[PDB]
Design a protein around this ligand. Structure first.
Ligand SMILES: Nc1nc2c(ncn2[C@@H]2O[C@H](COP(=O)(O)OP(=O)(O)OP(=O)(O)O)[C@@H](O)[C@H]2O)c(=O)[nH]1
Lengths: 770, 857
């Protein structure tokens, strides 16, 4: 679960390809170099009695004086004077030192391992080359960088720490204090209240909130908020304050170089306050590439410092129209599409035409300072969208899905050329779980063949040989890993192969079901034992061996009874604010809210009414966990994260409530239309099935009979157009936390694929029945 | 088929390669794309526009001094209307293709555009009128269009189309049209007349000899008219010829013209005759010298035998030439000229031992700088940015050390390689019998010369290859016991240094067999067989990791086993079965043998022991001699070997080629003849069959095999039998003479007394004091495994002593262990073809008396 990215695609930490300066050192007679740990090179003589542990000596230096210190230490230590190891990469030197890194290992550039009882002159000789150099502190021994071993009522700060890829220390970046002292006239900028040297310069804290919660409090997400319109008048007030103060402080030789979600702060009556003037450089003759900034805001390819801030001051006012800003690091000039997709939404709300046209003309004459920059790279293959249509007929939907299926083949094509480990592009969380109906290719292929089956007379190409050269390593790696479960576990592959090869899945299931089922302990649907769905699905049509079938049937009966006496125990029916799957709780993906499907299938099979009793017990244990929202409906309770979604929140609750009509009573149907009002929003900030808009639109209309749901296609496509970055004759959808492209079940090609095939075929084709 | 690629340590395949030059990037509007198809070009075409194949294309070239301006000056022309284009990616491929090491059929290819056939004049008039001040090379197999660089040709636009009939990707889509990519233009099967192009479409030297024609031309023999006499010509087209620096061909002929005009009173340096410029070419009239080079001078003068020196005085003949070289250094250094690249294709010695340095195509004229010796020879390549005067003196030093002993081919890999050679040279030159004054004078002049080239200490990561300064003599078995564990621990170090980075294979191999993976060849499993046969050979080993890697090599050498399709004993899917049998395991793959032995047998053509069915029959008779296969296939092997012998007896021409031929090479698939790669290994089957069955026809087949193999053996000046192809002699094991001595000496009682009299001549022929290669197929270790493998009496100690001493002459040292250098030594290879496993099985069979590489009875 770590992030390391190159342009265009996404990958893991294996793809580095470091190109820097090799360190290089000499070597005496009967000595050696070795790259043992692949991050340190170790020097050692041949014949010497090496002990274990003892003492270690650490020496740290600055960036510029590394190689001459290395030469002096080498000429001291090579002549029968102790083995030696050091850092092996100039590129990794700025991650070992510099800015905020891991607290356990920081510094420690030069290391030696003395032979216990010979230190009477080595430490004395190490002040010869030292005592005039420098370095970070990381315990002190003398007046030299020689060490021994066996953050942020005035808010303050702290000062060789903070080095980037260029030479700019955090103490150096002087710039902040000169920018504060030349801008002490205005109360929007903070004041300086401490001078001198670990230096402790302080600032005044202006009141306010960050603009993201201002967007969630002022930019509408439900239709009942912000009565009598007039929100665009406030938006005009903030952007007129930005243009006024921008023209006031760009008079005399000062620039900010970053105007992201930070450094802006609105208190009351639309009063901004720019804080933390830290990245202040100024020139107007040479051109500088924008080096360091927040994600979503990055200037391009060696322009003037007057127009570095141009893109930032355009975009900071641009996403106030409709906030989708984080995907501009991949698609240059992305923000044109947000304007035209916010204008139609604002007209659909019913705002005044004067306010909308004034805001559009205001952004137009801010764009009147318009220096495009024809950047020259390989990122420019993914050009923006400049065409917006309207869906009325079914052939438009067929054209959209045959366009979208091409982008899947195109994002498959470029992945195989430079990478060989997996078969398909990934998300950053589940980039190694290469099995099951989860973040894995085996769940991608059957969505592909389904949507090839649905549309029209598709080209057969060569996907037969592709499917067999996928299923060969699938049956190879059925068992060479750990864990168990349905989604990313063990026997989801059996269900997918049977839903794909019939006989092999049946005989692996009947030879491994009792062996794998007793190994797992939990009962949740992700990686537990509810497996019972696969067993009941194989039992209802009938392919299981008989006597083991009744044995596992009375087994699941007695675990159902045992669950009837005990509390929830295995899961919680969790005040953590995370998107993380293992930390997720209280949903259909994670919790006891999904066992209602398992109880309902057993009730639906012949006659078992103890599973009905399990249904009332499960819903009575599950209904307490949800808090109420403003619009009189149930909502997920933890933090300020009021997200009604398929997982955790309201949409999964509406899915589980309307699962079976026959089990319902008048006590159950007390929150039907209020919960439907909960899942009726004008904006979803991230797309997808598990954590996005597509799961909401699936849960809004799945089991309300009929098939003619063209309002559903209209709403889904006309709200899904805002998330797409176009390629040649196709689309590739950026996933959740979107900076790169993603193809998985949650946020990718397969999410939209499963969503559309579930809306067309109203059975929601995950966790099956019959 | 060769696939050579530079890499520090081990030389590998074309996979470790990253372009680190300034890349070329263009801009695209909407409805355009940037497909990167096949790693050379980047494809660009408007989206939705059907490109019409099978028309006319334009090749555009450029110079290195201004090429970006061609990109940003022709980009709006392709942006206007509809023109696809594809251009080269980085500057490194532009250097590699607009240079000197690339073929003339593919040179000058930078921009390729794709017009339609109906728009050619309209695009050509627009692009021609804006490129007046651009210029570049000619590009072969095209024709001149106007004055701007524009060259047309007939070529392939796209691959095969969507849903109609295609036959190829290169020919006419009308009869077959073969590709004729030669530096001429071809109009195939008449012409459909291009009305845009029909109007536009319509020396005091005599040629003597072309020694080369290279890429930029080069040295060209001819005859002058107004002066007569003999002359040579150097030619150089403008804007071609390019190193890894801004430097062209015409920037060096002017430099050597200056360097040969500044000095004129030296009779052994050539005099300029006519430095004229025909058209834009730079021709050059240079006189010719008589004589032979030093590279072939040591072939017939260095004592290879111990009688060939013709009554002493060889070292004085060395010393006069050496003092002639050391005299002619500061004579032209007074003019402050400097001549780089002092390799041994420039010092030519004529009659009465007079020298003449003839190649001057690198010449600086100032000395305060440190440059990389960028263009050099194999062996004389210098050591990272010293001043050019000591670069020249370093070249002089290694000239003198090749004159001392003729191995300097690996001095690029190990710094101060001259140390080991200078240590062994006194023992080489004192073991033959010479006066001490000559050796004293040679070492005195060398000890004068060695201090004018200053030593350096940086080495740059190849530090673990140190020269050897700790030599010993062999007079006890404990020396052999120490050497075997040292070599084995060095092989462990080799596996440790190979396991770090690469994983496509398991062991380092020579670059000939860089793709093969099985058998007693360039492989993996035979190396562990040698490892096991040497590890328990003394008493034991530590065995830190041998068990799990043995399990690994068997369960991914046996699991696939059929991915490649090739037959033979050496590398051909049945030697794999033999190594599984002889590793110490159970017979195991006998089921696979009975499954597909007839299938492997029935679909092969060659019958040599390298990759033919003769080794398959040897494996079969070995398994029948072990005593358990089946009741039926044992009869099938005999009923096939019967009439396999008879097709050879009635017609020996099909199974092998007799004669000497005209081939000077080292590739394993070319050199016919000899014990392994030819005819002399056929009689090994007849010997094994006679030792199993005992009947006369096998003996007669062996006698005819020995009779018809000895045709291609030319007698030396001394009484010695030598294998000879071309102008070279081959007294080696594989394609040589020591292979026949095994066949004669092993079957001594079977053979009659008529063929037993050749042993006294082949013992003289396989007795040299010097070799150039440290190997056993084609090297040294095979020449003294034939000496003591089957005598009668156990006298292993003296032969072992000689082998270990001359291997100390050839080895290289890492840590406490040891490595060895393979064929074409610039690297470290560990296999059974001039590697660690070969010297391992040599040290096995030198006292075990078996020669375990070939399966006996
Ligand atoms: N000057 C001269 N050259 C000859 C003679 N005979 C052959 N040559 C040619 O000189 C060439 C020397 O080429 P190399 O030794 O490869 O060196 P080079 O290719 O000239 O490159 P540089 O050594 O950098 O000039 C040979 O390839 C021969 O073709 C001769 O008598 N005199």
């Amino acid at each position: 679960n770590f992030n390391l990215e190159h342009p265009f695609f996404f990958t893991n930490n294996d793809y580095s390809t470091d190109t820097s300066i090799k360190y290089q050192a000499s070597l005496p007679f009967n000595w050696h170099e070795v790259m043992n740990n692949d991050e340190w090179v170790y020097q050692y003589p041949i014949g010497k009695f090496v002990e274990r542990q003892g003492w270690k000596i650490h020496i740290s230096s600055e960036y510029n004086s590394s190689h001459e210190l290395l030469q002096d230490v080498a000429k001291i230590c090579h002549e029968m004077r102790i083995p030696f190891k050091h850092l092996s990469t100039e590129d990794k030197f700025i991650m070992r030192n510099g800015k905020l890194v891991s607290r356990g290992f920081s510094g420690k550039f030069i290391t030696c391992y003395p032979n216990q009882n010979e230190l009477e002159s080595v430490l004395q000789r190490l002040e010869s080359a030292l005592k005039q150099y420098n370095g970070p502190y990381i315990k002190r021994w003398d007046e030299a960088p020689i060490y021994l071993r066996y953050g942020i009522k005035i808010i303050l700060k702290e000062a060789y720490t903070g080095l980037g890829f260029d030479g700019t220390y955090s103490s150096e970046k002087a710039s902040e204090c000169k920018a504060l002292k030349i801008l002490n006239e205005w109360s929007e900028a903070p004041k300086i209240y401490w001078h001198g040297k670990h230096t402790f310069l302080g600032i005044e804290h202006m009141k306010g909130v960050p603009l993201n919660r201002w967007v969630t409090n002022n930019f509408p997400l439900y239709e009942v908020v912000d009565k009598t319109k007039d929100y665009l008048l406030r938006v005009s007030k903030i952007v007129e304050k930005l243009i006024d103060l921008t023209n006031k402080f760009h008079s005399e030789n000062v620039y900010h170089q970053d105007l992201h979600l930070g450094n802006i702060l609105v208190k009351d009556e639309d009063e901004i306050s720019i804080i933390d003037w830290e990245q202040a450089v100024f020139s107007n003759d040479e051109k500088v590439v924008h080096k360091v900034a927040a994600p979503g805001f990055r200037a391009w390819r060696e322009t003037l410092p007057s127009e570095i801030d141009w893109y930032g001051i355009r975009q900071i006012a641009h996403y106030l129209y409709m906030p989708l800003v984080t995907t501009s690091d991949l698609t240059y000039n992305y923000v044109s599409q947000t304007r035209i997709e916010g204008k139609k939404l604002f007209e659909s709300l019913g705002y005044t035409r004067e306010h909308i046209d004034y805001v559009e003309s205001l952004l137009s004459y801010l764009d009147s300072k318009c220096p495009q920059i024809e950047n020259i790279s390989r990122k420019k293959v993914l050009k923006p969208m400049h065409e917006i249509r309207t869906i009325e007929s079914e052939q438009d939907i067929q054209d959209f899905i045959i366009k979208l299926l091409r982008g899947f083949t195109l994002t498959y094509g470029q992945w195989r050329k430079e990478f060989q480990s997996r078969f398909f592009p990934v998300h950053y969380y589940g980039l190694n779980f290469n099995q099951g109906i989860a973040f894995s290719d085996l769940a991608i292929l059957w969505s592909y063949q389904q949507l090839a089956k649905k549309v029209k007379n598709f080209k057969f190409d060569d996907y037969y040989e592709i499917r067999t050269q996928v299923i060969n390593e699938a049956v190879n790696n059925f068992k060479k890993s750990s864990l168990s479960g349905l989604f990313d576990g063990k026997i989801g592959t059996i269900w997918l192969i049977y839903e794909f090869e019939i006989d092999r899945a049946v005989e692996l299931f009947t030879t491994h079901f009792i062996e794998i089922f007793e190994n797992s302990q939990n009962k949740n649907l992700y990686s537990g034992q509810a497996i019972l769905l696969v067993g009941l699905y194989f039992l209802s049509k009938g392919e299981i061996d008989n006597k083991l079938g009744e044995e596992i049937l009375i087994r699941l009966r007695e675990y159902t009874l045992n669950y009837i006496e005990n509390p929830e125990t295995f899961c919680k029916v969790s005040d953590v604010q995370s998107n993380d799957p293992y930390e997720n709780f209280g949903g259909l993906l994670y919790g006891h809210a999904g066992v209602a499907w398992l109880f309902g299938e057993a009730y639906k099979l012949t006659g078992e009414s103890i599973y009905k009793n399990g249904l009332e017990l499960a819903v009575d244990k599950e209904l307490v966990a949800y808090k109420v929202d403003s619009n009189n409906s149930l909502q997920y309770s933890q933090g300020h994260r009021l997200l009604p979604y398929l997982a955790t929140g309201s949409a999964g609750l509406l899915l589980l409530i309307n699962r079976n009509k026959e089990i319902l009573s008048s006590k159950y149907l007390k929150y039907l239309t209020s919960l439907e009002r909960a899942t009726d929003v004008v904006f979803c900030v991230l797309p997808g099935l598990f954590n996005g808009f597509c799961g909401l639109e699936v849960a809004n209309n799945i089991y309300s009979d009929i098939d003619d749901n063209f309002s559903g296609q209209k709403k889904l496509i006309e709200q899904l157009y805002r998330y797409l970055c176009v390629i040649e004759e196709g689309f590739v959808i950026a996933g959740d936390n979107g900076l790169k492209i993603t193809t998985d079940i949650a946020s990718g090609f397969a999410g939209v694929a499963i969503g559309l095939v579930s809306i067309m075929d109203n059975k929601l084709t995950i966790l099956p029945q019959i």
